[PDB]
Protein backbone atom coordinates (compact mmCIF):
# COMPACT_ATOMS: atom_id res chain seq x y z
CA UNK A 1 0.00 0.00 0.00
CA UNK A 2 2.74 2.51 1.06
CA UNK A 3 4.43 1.94 -2.00
CA UNK A 4 4.21 5.06 -3.37
CA UNK A 5 5.13 6.50 -0.25
CA UNK A 6 8.48 4.84 -0.80
CA UNK A 7 8.73 5.63 -4.37
CA UNK A 8 8.49 9.79 -3.57
CA UNK A 9 11.36 9.00 -0.97
CA UNK A 10 13.50 6.86 -3.10
CA UNK A 11 13.37 9.65 -5.52
CA UNK A 12 15.23 12.27 -2.06
CA UNK A 13 17.47 9.51 -1.43
CA UNK A 14 21.47 9.88 -2.78
CA UNK A 15 22.31 8.17 -5.62
CA UNK A 16 24.54 5.19 -5.30
CA UNK A 17 26.44 2.41 -6.58
CA UNK A 18 25.57 -1.37 -7.08
CA UNK A 19 25.60 -3.28 -3.19
CA UNK A 20 26.45 -6.97 -3.55
CA UNK A 21 27.36 -7.18 0.04
CA UNK A 22 23.95 -6.51 0.78
CA UNK A 23 19.85 -7.24 0.34
CA UNK A 24 18.95 -4.39 -2.52
CA UNK A 25 15.16 -4.02 -1.95
CA UNK A 26 12.43 -2.14 -3.64
CA UNK A 27 10.13 0.28 -2.50
CA UNK A 28 7.42 -2.52 -3.27
CA UNK A 29 9.50 -5.05 -1.05
CA UNK A 30 9.64 -2.24 1.42
CA UNK A 31 6.05 -1.62 1.00
CA UNK A 32 5.77 -5.72 1.94
CA UNK A 33 7.79 -5.34 5.73
CA UNK A 34 10.38 -7.54 7.26
CA UNK A 35 12.43 -5.35 5.43
CA UNK A 36 15.01 -3.02 7.50
CA UNK A 37 16.89 -0.48 5.53
CA UNK A 38 20.42 -0.25 6.27
CA UNK A 39 21.39 3.29 4.65
CA UNK A 40 19.45 5.47 1.92
CA UNK A 41 22.20 5.33 -0.72
CA UNK A 42 20.15 4.61 -3.85
CA UNK A 43 20.70 2.43 -6.81
CA UNK A 44 18.29 1.74 -9.59
CA UNK A 45 15.16 2.38 -7.51
CA UNK A 46 17.13 0.37 -4.76
CA UNK A 47 18.30 0.22 -1.50
CA UNK A 48 19.69 -2.00 0.84
CA UNK A 49 17.93 -3.43 3.59
CA UNK A 50 17.85 -5.82 7.00
CA UNK A 51 15.61 -9.15 7.02
CA UNK A 52 14.67 -8.19 10.83
CA UNK A 53 10.78 -8.74 11.38
CA UNK A 54 9.89 -4.84 10.49
CA UNK A 55 6.39 -3.27 10.51
CA UNK A 56 6.11 -0.99 6.86
CA UNK A 57 5.74 2.43 8.20
CA UNK A 58 8.84 1.50 10.47
CA UNK A 59 10.87 0.58 7.24
CA UNK A 60 9.43 3.83 6.02
CA UNK A 61 10.72 5.94 9.41
CA UNK A 62 14.23 4.33 9.63
CA UNK A 63 14.71 5.25 5.48
CA UNK A 64 13.48 8.97 6.15
CA UNK A 65 15.51 9.37 8.94
CA UNK A 66 18.76 8.33 7.12
CA UNK A 67 17.84 10.38 4.37
CA UNK A 68 18.03 13.29 7.00
CA UNK A 69 20.90 12.66 8.16
CA UNK A 70 22.90 12.05 4.57
CA UNK A 71 20.89 16.02 4.16
CA UNK A 72 21.90 17.46 7.15
CA UNK A 73 25.74 16.67 6.25
CA UNK A 74 25.98 17.31 3.00
CA UNK A 75 29.86 23.18 2.58
CA UNK A 76 32.08 25.80 1.53
CA UNK A 77 34.55 25.86 -1.45
CA UNK A 78 37.93 27.39 -2.49
CA UNK A 79 37.97 29.56 -5.46
CA UNK A 80 40.08 28.82 -8.09
CA UNK A 81 43.22 30.45 -8.74
CA UNK A 82 42.05 31.44 -12.28
CA UNK A 83 38.70 33.20 -11.40
CA UNK A 84 40.85 35.46 -8.64
CA UNK A 85 40.91 38.40 -10.79
CA UNK A 86 36.91 39.01 -10.35
CA UNK A 87 37.70 39.38 -6.79
CA UNK A 88 39.65 42.63 -7.78
CA UNK A 89 37.15 43.89 -9.46
CA UNK A 90 34.19 43.23 -6.32
CA UNK A 91 33.47 47.48 -4.78
CA UNK A 92 29.98 46.46 -2.83
CA UNK A 93 29.16 43.64 -0.69
CA UNK A 94 26.83 41.53 -2.29
CA UNK A 95 23.07 41.46 -1.85
CA UNK A 96 22.33 37.98 -3.55
CA UNK A 97 21.63 35.70 -0.65
CA UNK A 98 22.98 32.70 -2.44
CA UNK A 99 22.73 29.87 -0.15
CA UNK A 100 24.95 27.32 -2.09
CA UNK A 101 27.02 29.18 -4.07
CA UNK A 102 29.61 32.14 -3.73
CA UNK A 103 28.00 35.92 -4.07
CA UNK A 104 31.25 37.94 -3.32
CA UNK A 105 30.09 41.23 -3.95
CA UNK A 106 29.31 43.54 -6.72
CA UNK A 107 31.19 45.58 -9.36
CA UNK A 108 30.58 49.03 -10.73
CA UNK A 109 27.82 49.79 -12.51
CA UNK A 110 28.23 49.72 -16.56
CA UNK A 111 26.69 52.05 -19.11
CA UNK A 112 12.68 46.66 -24.32
CA UNK A 113 9.08 46.10 -24.03
CA UNK A 114 6.26 44.25 -25.65
CA UNK A 115 4.57 46.29 -28.17
CA UNK A 116 2.13 45.63 -30.96
CA UNK A 117 2.75 44.39 -34.74
CA UNK A 118 0.32 47.35 -35.99
CA UNK A 119 -0.52 45.77 -38.20
CA UNK A 120 -0.96 42.24 -37.55
CA UNK A 121 -2.95 43.07 -34.51
CA UNK A 122 -5.11 44.94 -36.32
CA UNK A 123 -5.76 42.50 -38.83
CA UNK A 124 -6.93 40.66 -35.56
CA UNK A 125 -9.04 43.38 -34.39
CA UNK A 126 -10.55 43.78 -37.26
CA UNK A 127 -12.20 40.47 -37.29
CA UNK A 128 -13.37 40.35 -33.75
CA UNK A 129 -10.27 38.68 -32.44
CA UNK A 130 -9.85 40.32 -28.76
CA UNK A 131 -6.20 40.96 -28.29
CA UNK A 132 -6.61 41.77 -24.55
CA UNK A 133 -7.67 37.73 -23.69
CA UNK A 134 -4.52 36.44 -25.82
CA UNK A 135 -2.23 34.64 -23.35
CA UNK A 136 0.96 36.85 -22.35
CA UNK A 137 3.96 36.02 -24.35
CA UNK A 138 7.66 37.44 -24.32
CA UNK A 139 7.48 38.90 -20.89
CA UNK A 140 10.64 40.38 -18.75
CA UNK A 141 10.87 40.75 -15.53
CA UNK A 142 12.64 43.37 -12.66
CA UNK A 143 15.66 43.12 -11.06
CA UNK A 144 14.01 42.07 -7.73
CA UNK A 145 12.11 38.78 -9.84
CA UNK A 146 15.36 38.51 -11.64
CA UNK A 147 17.72 37.46 -8.28
CA UNK A 148 14.60 35.71 -6.59
CA UNK A 149 15.13 33.64 -10.56
CA UNK A 150 18.67 32.86 -9.44
CA UNK A 151 18.00 31.86 -6.06
CA UNK A 152 15.42 29.68 -7.06
CA UNK A 153 16.99 28.01 -10.20
CA UNK A 154 20.79 28.60 -10.04
CA UNK A 155 21.70 28.66 -6.55
CA UNK A 156 22.16 24.94 -5.52
CA UNK A 157 24.78 22.38 -5.28
CA UNK A 158 25.73 19.85 -7.96
CA UNK A 159 23.32 16.94 -8.49
CA UNK A 160 25.02 13.79 -6.96
CA UNK A 161 24.91 10.82 -9.50
CA UNK A 162 25.22 7.59 -9.91
CA UNK A 163 28.81 6.36 -8.76
CA UNK A 164 30.01 4.96 -12.03
CA UNK A 165 27.60 7.09 -14.59
CA UNK A 166 30.18 8.52 -16.73
CA UNK A 167 31.97 5.59 -17.75
CA UNK A 168 28.79 3.64 -18.67
CA UNK A 169 27.72 7.11 -20.66
CA UNK A 170 31.38 6.94 -22.55
CA UNK A 171 30.24 3.28 -23.03
CA UNK A 172 26.70 5.22 -24.60
CA UNK A 173 28.56 7.04 -26.53
CA UNK A 174 31.08 4.04 -27.90
CA UNK A 175 28.19 2.64 -29.64
CA UNK A 176 27.30 5.58 -31.31
CA UNK A 177 30.60 6.99 -32.43
CA UNK A 178 31.84 7.85 -35.78
CA UNK A 179 35.24 6.50 -36.11
CA UNK A 180 35.62 7.91 -39.46
CA UNK A 181 36.08 11.18 -38.01
CA UNK A 182 38.03 10.23 -35.13
CA UNK A 183 40.96 13.59 -34.63
CA UNK A 184 40.11 14.98 -37.54
CA UNK A 185 37.96 18.75 -36.78
CA UNK A 186 40.18 21.47 -36.75
CA UNK A 187 39.31 25.19 -36.36
CA UNK A 188 37.68 27.46 -39.38
CA UNK A 189 38.70 30.13 -41.24
CA UNK A 190 37.28 33.50 -40.40
CA UNK A 191 35.24 33.66 -43.97
CA UNK A 192 33.40 30.39 -42.70
CA UNK A 193 32.81 31.69 -39.84
CA UNK A 194 31.65 34.83 -40.31
CA UNK A 195 29.16 33.14 -42.63
CA UNK A 196 26.77 32.11 -40.06
CA UNK A 197 26.94 35.04 -37.51
CA UNK A 198 24.50 37.44 -35.71
CA UNK A 199 26.54 40.77 -35.89
CA UNK A 200 24.44 42.15 -33.44
CA UNK A 201 24.90 39.24 -30.33
CA UNK A 202 25.37 40.50 -27.45
CA UNK A 203 28.24 42.41 -25.76
CA UNK A 204 29.25 40.80 -22.44
CA UNK A 205 29.33 42.84 -18.63
CA UNK A 206 32.61 44.14 -19.37
CA UNK A 207 32.26 44.47 -22.94
CA UNK A 208 31.46 47.11 -25.50
CA UNK A 209 31.23 45.50 -28.46
CA UNK A 210 29.28 43.25 -30.10
CA UNK A 211 29.91 40.73 -32.22
CA UNK A 212 30.28 42.64 -35.95
CA UNK A 213 31.89 45.60 -34.01
CA UNK A 214 34.38 43.03 -32.75
CA UNK A 215 34.64 41.37 -36.11
CA UNK A 216 35.37 44.14 -37.81
CA UNK A 217 38.15 45.52 -35.41
CA UNK A 218 39.59 43.23 -32.75
CA UNK A 219 39.85 39.86 -34.26
CA UNK A 220 43.53 39.96 -32.61
CA UNK A 221 41.84 39.95 -29.54
CA UNK A 222 40.01 37.11 -30.56
CA UNK A 223 43.03 35.20 -31.32
CA UNK A 224 44.86 36.47 -28.44
CA UNK A 225 42.06 34.31 -26.69
CA UNK A 226 42.02 31.50 -28.72
CA UNK A 227 46.46 31.07 -28.26
CA UNK A 228 45.94 31.89 -24.39
CA UNK A 229 43.43 28.33 -24.17
CA UNK A 230 45.40 26.40 -26.94
CA UNK A 231 48.37 26.77 -24.85
CA UNK A 232 47.00 25.48 -21.51
CA UNK A 233 46.29 29.19 -20.09
CA UNK A 234 44.10 30.87 -18.10
CA UNK A 235 41.86 33.32 -19.62
CA UNK A 236 39.48 35.77 -17.91
CA UNK A 237 36.43 33.89 -18.35
CA UNK A 238 33.11 35.11 -16.84
CA UNK A 239 29.64 34.58 -17.96
CA UNK A 240 27.03 37.84 -18.15
CA UNK A 241 23.04 37.04 -16.19
CA UNK A 242 20.21 38.83 -17.68
CA UNK A 243 17.03 37.94 -17.25
CA UNK A 244 15.48 36.23 -20.83
CA UNK A 245 13.68 39.18 -22.82
CA UNK A 246 16.44 41.60 -22.14
CA UNK A 247 18.24 43.65 -24.62
CA UNK A 248 20.89 41.64 -24.66
CA UNK A 249 19.18 38.51 -25.20
CA UNK A 250 20.24 37.71 -28.72
CA UNK A 251 20.78 34.68 -30.43
CA UNK A 252 24.47 34.35 -32.21
CA UNK A 253 22.37 31.75 -34.86
CA UNK A 254 19.54 31.85 -36.88
CA UNK A 255 16.76 29.65 -34.87
CA UNK A 256 14.14 27.11 -36.27
CA UNK A 257 11.56 29.18 -34.95
CA UNK A 258 10.15 31.33 -31.42
CA UNK A 259 10.31 27.93 -29.53
CA UNK A 260 14.19 28.16 -29.09
CA UNK A 261 13.48 31.88 -27.64
CA UNK A 262 10.71 30.64 -25.64
CA UNK A 263 12.21 27.57 -23.90
CA UNK A 264 15.24 29.80 -22.66
CA UNK A 265 15.76 29.73 -18.75
CA UNK A 266 14.73 33.00 -17.01
CA UNK A 267 18.54 33.25 -16.63
CA UNK A 268 20.39 34.44 -20.05
CA UNK A 269 24.12 33.40 -19.08
CA UNK A 270 26.29 34.28 -21.85
CA UNK A 271 30.28 34.64 -22.13
CA UNK A 272 31.67 37.61 -23.82
CA UNK A 273 31.28 37.87 -27.64
CA UNK A 274 34.95 37.64 -28.08
CA UNK A 275 35.25 34.90 -26.27
CA UNK A 276 32.32 33.21 -27.98
CA UNK A 277 34.25 33.84 -31.35
CA UNK A 278 37.10 32.52 -30.27
CA UNK A 279 35.16 28.99 -28.98
CA UNK A 280 33.37 29.07 -32.31
CA UNK A 281 36.10 29.56 -34.34
CA UNK A 282 37.99 26.59 -33.10
CA UNK A 283 34.98 24.41 -31.86
CA UNK A 284 32.98 25.28 -34.99
CA UNK A 285 32.29 21.69 -36.38
CA UNK A 286 31.07 20.42 -32.98
CA UNK A 287 29.11 23.87 -31.82
CA UNK A 288 27.65 23.77 -34.98
CA UNK A 289 27.13 20.16 -35.89
CA UNK A 290 28.92 19.85 -39.29
CA UNK A 291 28.48 16.86 -39.68
CA UNK A 292 25.61 15.83 -37.82
CA UNK A 293 27.58 13.20 -35.26
CA UNK A 294 24.98 13.27 -32.68
CA UNK A 295 22.65 10.70 -33.55
CA UNK A 296 18.54 12.27 -33.59
CA UNK A 297 19.92 16.15 -33.32
CA UNK A 298 17.41 17.62 -35.10
CA UNK A 299 18.69 21.30 -34.49
CA UNK A 300 19.17 21.92 -38.38
CA UNK A 301 15.40 20.28 -39.18
CA UNK A 302 13.27 23.09 -40.39
CA UNK A 303 10.11 23.15 -38.06
CA UNK A 304 7.84 22.66 -41.17
CA UNK A 305 9.60 19.23 -41.80
CA UNK A 306 10.44 17.48 -38.50
CA UNK A 307 6.86 15.63 -37.88
CA UNK A 308 7.09 14.00 -41.66
CA UNK A 309 10.10 12.72 -41.09
CA UNK A 310 9.64 11.45 -37.80
CA UNK A 311 6.59 9.76 -39.13
CA UNK A 312 8.57 7.42 -41.25
CA UNK A 313 9.93 6.10 -38.64
CA UNK A 314 6.84 5.36 -36.38
CA UNK A 315 5.22 4.17 -39.35
CA UNK A 316 8.10 1.18 -38.88
CA UNK A 317 7.28 -0.12 -35.94
CA UNK A 318 4.00 -2.99 -35.30
CA UNK A 319 2.98 -0.84 -31.99
CA UNK A 320 4.82 2.48 -31.61
CA UNK A 321 4.92 4.85 -28.71
CA UNK A 322 6.66 7.77 -28.22
CA UNK A 323 7.88 8.50 -24.48
CA UNK A 324 8.99 12.45 -24.16
CA UNK A 325 11.81 13.29 -22.69
CA UNK A 326 11.03 15.98 -19.80
CA UNK A 327 13.72 17.69 -17.76
CA UNK A 328 13.32 19.69 -15.21
CA UNK A 329 15.16 22.98 -15.75
CA UNK A 330 18.12 20.98 -17.69
CA UNK A 331 20.83 23.70 -17.96
CA UNK A 332 20.66 23.81 -14.10
CA UNK A 333 20.94 19.67 -13.85
CA UNK A 334 24.50 19.85 -15.78
CA UNK A 335 27.30 18.55 -13.72
CA UNK A 336 30.74 19.17 -13.34
CA UNK A 337 31.16 15.02 -14.73
CA UNK A 338 28.51 15.88 -17.81
CA UNK A 339 30.30 18.48 -18.51
CA UNK A 340 34.18 16.28 -18.70
CA UNK A 341 32.12 14.00 -20.35
CA UNK A 342 31.50 16.24 -23.40
CA UNK A 343 35.32 16.98 -23.21
CA UNK A 344 36.21 13.82 -23.54
CA UNK A 345 33.56 13.37 -26.48
CA UNK A 346 35.11 16.70 -28.08
CA UNK A 347 38.37 15.09 -27.41
CA UNK A 348 37.71 11.96 -29.79
CA UNK A 349 36.86 13.85 -32.58
CA UNK A 350 38.82 16.85 -32.53
CA UNK A 351 42.85 17.16 -33.73
CA UNK A 352 45.27 16.55 -31.05
CA UNK A 353 46.68 20.35 -31.14
CA UNK A 354 43.19 21.62 -29.93
CA UNK A 355 42.74 19.19 -26.54
CA UNK A 356 45.11 21.60 -24.32
CA UNK A 357 42.10 24.20 -25.55
CA UNK A 358 39.25 21.87 -24.94
CA UNK A 359 40.61 20.98 -21.60
CA UNK A 360 41.41 24.54 -20.17
CA UNK A 361 38.03 25.70 -21.63
CA UNK A 362 36.21 23.07 -19.74
CA UNK A 363 38.14 24.02 -16.38
CA UNK A 364 36.89 27.31 -16.92
CA UNK A 365 33.11 26.33 -17.52
CA UNK A 366 33.09 24.17 -14.75
CA UNK A 367 33.70 27.07 -12.07
CA UNK A 368 32.09 30.05 -13.92
CA UNK A 369 32.21 33.85 -12.45
CA UNK A 370 28.79 35.28 -13.56
CA UNK A 371 28.31 39.36 -13.32
CA UNK A 372 24.62 39.92 -13.09
CA UNK A 373 22.79 43.23 -15.28
CA UNK A 374 22.72 44.99 -12.14
CA UNK A 375 26.63 44.27 -11.00
CA UNK A 376 26.20 40.81 -8.44
CA UNK A 377 28.67 38.72 -8.61
CA UNK A 378 27.78 34.93 -8.16
CA UNK A 379 29.97 31.95 -8.68
CA UNK A 380 28.30 29.18 -10.67
CA UNK A 381 29.59 25.38 -10.04
CA UNK A 382 29.49 23.69 -13.05
CA UNK A 383 25.33 24.00 -14.85
CA UNK A 384 24.90 24.75 -18.68
CA UNK A 385 24.94 29.09 -19.23
CA UNK A 386 22.23 29.35 -21.78
CA UNK A 387 24.36 31.46 -24.18
CA UNK A 388 27.96 29.11 -24.40
CA UNK A 389 28.44 28.56 -27.92
CA UNK A 390 28.32 24.26 -26.81
CA UNK A 391 24.58 24.73 -25.16
CA UNK A 392 22.76 22.81 -28.33
CA UNK A 393 25.23 20.43 -29.40
CA UNK A 394 26.85 19.96 -25.83
CA UNK A 395 23.31 19.23 -23.97
CA UNK A 396 21.80 17.19 -26.87
CA UNK A 397 24.74 15.16 -26.78
CA UNK A 398 24.39 14.85 -23.12
CA UNK A 399 20.52 14.27 -23.49
CA UNK A 400 21.23 11.38 -26.11
CA UNK A 401 23.38 9.28 -23.85
CA UNK A 402 21.43 10.06 -21.21
CA UNK A 403 18.68 8.65 -21.94
CA UNK A 404 19.80 5.85 -23.61
CA UNK A 405 21.48 5.15 -20.95
CA UNK A 406 18.26 5.18 -18.94
CA UNK A 407 16.41 3.25 -21.45
CA UNK A 408 18.94 0.28 -21.79
CA UNK A 409 18.82 0.06 -17.89
CA UNK A 410 15.12 0.60 -17.47
CA UNK A 411 14.15 -2.55 -20.33
CA UNK A 412 17.65 -4.37 -20.03
CA UNK A 413 17.98 -3.71 -23.86
CA UNK A 414 22.63 -3.86 -24.46
CA UNK A 415 23.61 0.00 -25.21
CA UNK A 416 25.02 -1.64 -28.35
CA UNK A 417 21.16 -2.69 -29.55
CA UNK A 418 19.28 0.41 -28.77
CA UNK A 419 19.42 1.87 -32.80
CA UNK A 420 17.65 -1.70 -33.59
CA UNK A 421 14.24 -1.29 -31.01
CA UNK A 422 14.25 2.44 -30.69
CA UNK A 423 14.87 5.71 -32.82
CA UNK A 424 15.81 8.92 -30.52
CA UNK A 425 15.22 12.53 -31.30
CA UNK A 426 16.91 15.57 -29.60
CA UNK A 427 17.15 19.35 -29.46
CA UNK A 428 18.87 19.92 -26.47
CA UNK A 429 17.26 18.77 -23.37
CA UNK A 430 13.91 18.58 -25.21
CA UNK A 431 13.31 15.56 -27.56
CA UNK A 432 11.29 11.92 -27.18
CA UNK A 433 11.98 8.75 -28.46
CA UNK A 434 9.66 5.84 -30.50
CA UNK A 435 10.32 2.37 -29.65
CA UNK A 436 7.53 -0.63 -29.50
CA UNK A 437 4.92 -0.20 -26.38
CA UNK A 438 6.12 -2.58 -24.13
CA UNK A 439 9.46 -1.59 -24.21
CA UNK A 440 7.72 2.09 -23.97
CA UNK A 441 5.94 1.61 -20.82
CA UNK A 442 8.76 -0.06 -19.40
CA UNK A 443 10.92 2.32 -19.71
CA UNK A 444 8.44 5.18 -18.72
CA UNK A 445 7.67 3.59 -15.57
CA UNK A 446 11.07 2.62 -14.70
CA UNK A 447 12.36 6.02 -15.93
CA UNK A 448 11.80 8.73 -13.74
CA UNK A 449 13.90 7.13 -10.55
CA UNK A 450 17.01 5.94 -13.31
CA UNK A 451 16.88 9.20 -14.53
CA UNK A 452 16.89 11.10 -11.06
CA UNK A 453 20.15 9.41 -10.26
CA UNK A 454 21.45 9.73 -13.13
CA UNK A 455 21.06 13.71 -12.28
CA UNK A 456 18.76 14.50 -14.77
CA UNK A 457 14.96 15.05 -12.84
CA UNK A 458 11.68 14.64 -14.54
CA UNK A 459 9.28 17.12 -14.05
CA UNK A 460 7.02 15.90 -10.99
CA UNK A 461 3.85 14.49 -12.64
CA UNK A 462 0.55 11.61 -11.86
CA UNK A 463 2.03 8.22 -10.36
CA UNK A 464 6.19 9.28 -11.41
CA UNK A 465 5.41 7.95 -15.13
CA UNK A 466 7.02 9.73 -17.93
CA UNK A 467 4.57 10.60 -20.45
CA UNK A 468 3.83 8.11 -23.70
CA UNK A 469 2.09 9.30 -26.69
CA UNK A 470 0.07 6.40 -27.75
CA UNK A 471 -0.92 7.95 -31.29
CA UNK A 472 1.47 9.77 -33.67
CA UNK A 473 -0.24 13.34 -33.21
CA UNK A 474 0.51 12.95 -29.36
CA UNK A 475 4.17 13.54 -29.94
CA UNK A 476 5.55 16.81 -28.69
CA UNK A 477 8.30 18.41 -29.99
CA UNK A 478 10.16 22.10 -29.92
CA UNK A 479 6.45 23.09 -28.26
CA UNK A 480 4.32 21.57 -31.43
CA UNK A 481 2.61 18.85 -31.92
CA UNK A 482 1.92 17.03 -35.25
CA UNK A 483 -1.35 17.61 -37.51
CA UNK A 484 -2.90 16.33 -40.58
CA UNK A 485 -3.89 17.93 -43.55
CA UNK A 486 -5.14 16.78 -47.00
CA UNK A 487 -4.00 17.64 -50.46
CA UNK A 488 -5.72 18.20 -53.08
CA UNK A 489 -3.43 15.46 -54.94
CA UNK A 490 -5.01 12.59 -52.64
CA UNK A 491 -2.12 12.77 -50.09
CA UNK A 492 -1.61 13.68 -46.83
CA UNK A 493 1.17 14.85 -44.51
CA UNK A 494 1.72 16.28 -40.95
CA UNK A 495 2.70 20.35 -40.19
CA UNK A 496 3.49 21.75 -36.75
CA UNK A 497 0.23 22.23 -34.99
CA UNK A 498 0.25 24.56 -31.95
CA UNK A 499 -2.71 25.93 -29.81
CA UNK A 500 -4.44 28.84 -31.93
CA UNK A 501 -4.57 31.31 -29.05
CA UNK A 502 -0.34 30.81 -28.46
CA UNK A 503 0.32 31.28 -32.12
CA UNK A 504 -2.08 34.84 -32.35
CA UNK A 505 -0.26 36.11 -29.52
CA UNK A 506 2.75 35.24 -30.93
CA UNK A 507 2.58 36.83 -34.36
CA UNK A 508 0.59 39.95 -32.51
CA UNK A 509 3.55 41.19 -30.51
CA UNK A 510 7.59 42.07 -30.14
CA UNK A 511 9.98 43.66 -28.19
CA UNK A 512 10.85 46.61 -29.24
CA UNK A 513 7.53 48.14 -39.62
CA UNK A 514 5.24 46.71 -42.47
CA UNK A 515 8.37 45.11 -43.79
CA UNK A 516 9.03 43.36 -40.41
CA UNK A 517 5.71 41.99 -40.15
CA UNK A 518 5.28 40.96 -43.60
CA UNK A 519 8.72 38.79 -42.72
CA UNK A 520 6.72 37.61 -39.84
CA UNK A 521 3.36 36.60 -42.04
CA UNK A 522 5.67 34.82 -44.10
CA UNK A 523 7.18 32.89 -41.60
CA UNK A 524 3.85 31.51 -39.58
CA UNK A 525 2.37 31.05 -43.22
CA UNK A 526 5.30 28.64 -43.62
CA UNK A 527 4.57 26.65 -40.08
CA UNK A 528 0.90 27.13 -39.48
CA UNK A 529 -1.04 27.10 -42.88
CA UNK A 530 -3.23 24.11 -41.50
CA UNK A 531 -4.35 26.69 -39.41
CA UNK A 532 -6.99 28.74 -41.71
CA UNK A 533 -7.61 31.40 -39.16
CA UNK A 534 -3.57 31.88 -38.98
CA UNK A 535 -3.61 31.02 -42.32
CA UNK A 536 -5.82 34.00 -43.76
CA UNK A 537 -4.38 36.59 -41.51
CA UNK A 538 -1.24 36.00 -42.75
CA UNK A 539 -2.60 36.62 -46.24
CA UNK A 540 -4.08 40.00 -45.29
CA UNK A 541 -0.78 41.26 -43.75
CA UNK A 542 1.29 39.55 -47.12
CA UNK A 543 -1.30 41.15 -49.38
CA UNK A 544 -0.35 44.60 -47.44
CA UNK A 545 1.60 47.16 -49.85
CA UNK A 546 3.26 44.32 -52.32
CA UNK A 547 5.69 47.33 -53.14
CA UNK A 548 8.19 46.92 -49.94
CA UNK A 549 10.02 43.92 -49.51
CA UNK A 550 9.72 41.43 -46.23
CA UNK A 551 12.52 42.17 -43.85
CA UNK A 552 15.02 39.78 -43.09
CA UNK A 553 15.13 40.07 -39.01
CA UNK A 554 13.05 36.72 -38.57
CA UNK A 555 13.13 33.23 -39.12
CA UNK A 556 12.12 33.43 -42.62
CA UNK A 557 11.51 35.87 -45.79
CA UNK A 558 11.03 34.99 -49.37
CA UNK A 559 12.31 36.49 -52.32
CA UNK A 560 9.60 37.60 -54.98
CA UNK A 561 6.57 35.36 -54.51
CA UNK A 562 5.97 34.84 -51.38
CA UNK A 563 2.84 32.10 -52.40
CA UNK A 564 5.84 30.10 -54.86
CA UNK A 565 8.00 30.91 -51.90
CA UNK A 566 6.19 28.37 -49.79
CA UNK A 567 5.42 25.73 -52.15
CA UNK A 568 8.83 25.26 -52.89
CA UNK A 569 9.29 24.47 -49.11
CA UNK A 570 5.86 22.88 -48.45
CA UNK A 571 5.82 21.07 -51.92
CA UNK A 572 2.87 21.70 -52.67
CA UNK A 573 0.57 24.96 -53.52
CA UNK A 574 -1.24 26.64 -50.15
CA UNK A 575 -4.41 26.12 -52.98
CA UNK A 576 -4.26 22.49 -52.74
CA UNK A 577 -4.33 22.29 -49.15
CA UNK A 578 -8.35 21.00 -48.70
CA UNK A 579 -8.51 19.79 -45.00
CA UNK A 580 -7.33 19.95 -42.05
CA UNK A 581 -7.81 17.13 -39.32
CA UNK A 582 -10.66 18.07 -37.93
CA UNK A 583 -10.28 16.35 -34.29
CA UNK A 584 -7.05 17.76 -33.97
CA UNK A 585 -7.88 21.30 -35.34
CA UNK A 586 -10.57 20.88 -31.99
CA UNK A 587 -8.03 20.29 -29.70
CA UNK A 588 -5.31 23.23 -30.81
CA UNK A 589 -8.54 25.58 -31.07
CA UNK A 590 -10.13 24.81 -27.33
CA UNK A 591 -8.71 27.65 -25.34
CA UNK A 592 -10.04 30.30 -27.69
CA UNK A 593 -13.24 29.67 -26.81
CA UNK A 594 -12.05 28.89 -23.51
CA UNK A 595 -10.21 32.44 -23.07
CA UNK A 596 -12.69 33.99 -25.21
CA UNK A 597 -10.32 35.39 -27.89
CA UNK A 598 -12.86 34.75 -30.62
CA UNK A 599 -16.61 34.53 -30.86
CA UNK A 600 -19.00 32.84 -33.22
CA UNK A 601 -18.70 35.65 -35.92
CA UNK A 602 -14.96 35.66 -36.11
CA UNK A 603 -13.98 32.99 -38.12
CA UNK A 604 -16.77 34.37 -40.96
CA UNK A 605 -15.77 37.77 -40.46
CA UNK A 606 -12.22 36.41 -41.58
CA UNK A 607 -12.80 34.88 -44.19
CA UNK A 608 -15.92 37.53 -45.51
CA UNK A 609 -12.99 39.97 -45.26
CA UNK A 610 -10.89 37.78 -47.58
CA UNK A 611 -13.51 37.25 -49.84
CA UNK A 612 -14.58 40.62 -50.07
CA UNK A 613 -10.70 41.55 -51.09
CA UNK A 614 -10.64 38.38 -53.52
CA UNK A 615 -14.00 39.11 -55.83
CA UNK A 616 -12.20 42.40 -56.74
CA UNK A 617 -10.44 42.33 -60.09
CA UNK A 618 -6.97 41.75 -60.14
CA UNK A 619 -4.08 39.11 -58.73
CA UNK A 620 -4.63 39.06 -54.82
CA UNK A 621 -2.77 36.68 -52.83
CA UNK A 622 -6.21 35.58 -50.40
CA UNK A 623 -7.22 33.49 -53.23
CA UNK A 624 -4.24 31.01 -52.53
CA UNK A 625 -6.70 30.33 -50.00
CA UNK A 626 -9.01 27.22 -51.62
CA UNK A 627 -11.80 28.22 -49.66
CA UNK A 628 -11.49 31.59 -50.34
CA UNK A 629 -11.17 31.58 -54.06
CA UNK A 630 -14.24 28.98 -54.26
CA UNK A 631 -16.07 32.10 -52.93
CA UNK A 632 -14.55 34.59 -54.83
CA UNK A 633 -14.36 32.81 -58.36
CA UNK A 634 -10.98 34.00 -58.65
CA UNK A 635 -7.56 32.65 -58.42
CA UNK A 636 -4.25 33.65 -57.55
CA UNK A 637 -1.56 32.96 -60.38
CA UNK A 638 2.25 33.35 -58.71
CA UNK A 639 5.32 34.75 -60.23
CA UNK A 640 8.63 33.18 -58.79
CA UNK A 641 9.81 33.14 -55.63
CA UNK A 642 12.27 31.40 -52.81
CA UNK A 643 12.40 30.93 -49.31
CA UNK A 644 15.62 32.36 -47.39
CA UNK A 645 16.44 31.80 -44.02
CA UNK A 646 18.32 34.72 -41.77
Known amino acids: NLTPLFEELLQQCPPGGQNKTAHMVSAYQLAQGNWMPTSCHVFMGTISARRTKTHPYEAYVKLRELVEEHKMKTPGSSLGKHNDWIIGKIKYQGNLRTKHMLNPGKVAEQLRHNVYNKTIGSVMTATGIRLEKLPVVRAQTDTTNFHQAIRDKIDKEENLQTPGLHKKLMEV ?4 KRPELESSYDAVEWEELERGINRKGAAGFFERKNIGEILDSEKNKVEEIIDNLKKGRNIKYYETAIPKNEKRDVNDDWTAGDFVDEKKPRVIQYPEAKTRLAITKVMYKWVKQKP ?6 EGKTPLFQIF ?24 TQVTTKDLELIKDIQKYYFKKKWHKFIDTLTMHMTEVPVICADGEVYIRKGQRGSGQPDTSAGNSMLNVLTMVYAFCEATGVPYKSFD ?33 EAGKPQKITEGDKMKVAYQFDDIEFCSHTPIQVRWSDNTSSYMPGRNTTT ?4 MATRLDTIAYEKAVAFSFLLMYSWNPLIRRICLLVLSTELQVKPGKSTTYYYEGDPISAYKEV ?27 AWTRHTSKR ?3 DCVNMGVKEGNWLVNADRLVSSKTGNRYIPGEGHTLQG
Not at 173 to 176: D, S, Y
Not at 292 to 297: L, M, T
Not at 503 to 506: E, G, H, S, Y
Not at 578 to 585: A, I, Q
Request: positive net charge.
Open 292 to 297: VVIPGY
Open 420 to 452: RVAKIHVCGDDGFLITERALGEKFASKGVQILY
Open 308 to 331: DKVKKEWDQFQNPVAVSFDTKAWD
Open 606 to 608: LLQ
Open 503 to 506: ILAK
Open 570 to 596: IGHNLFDLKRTSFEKLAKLNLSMSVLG
Open 173 to 176: FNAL
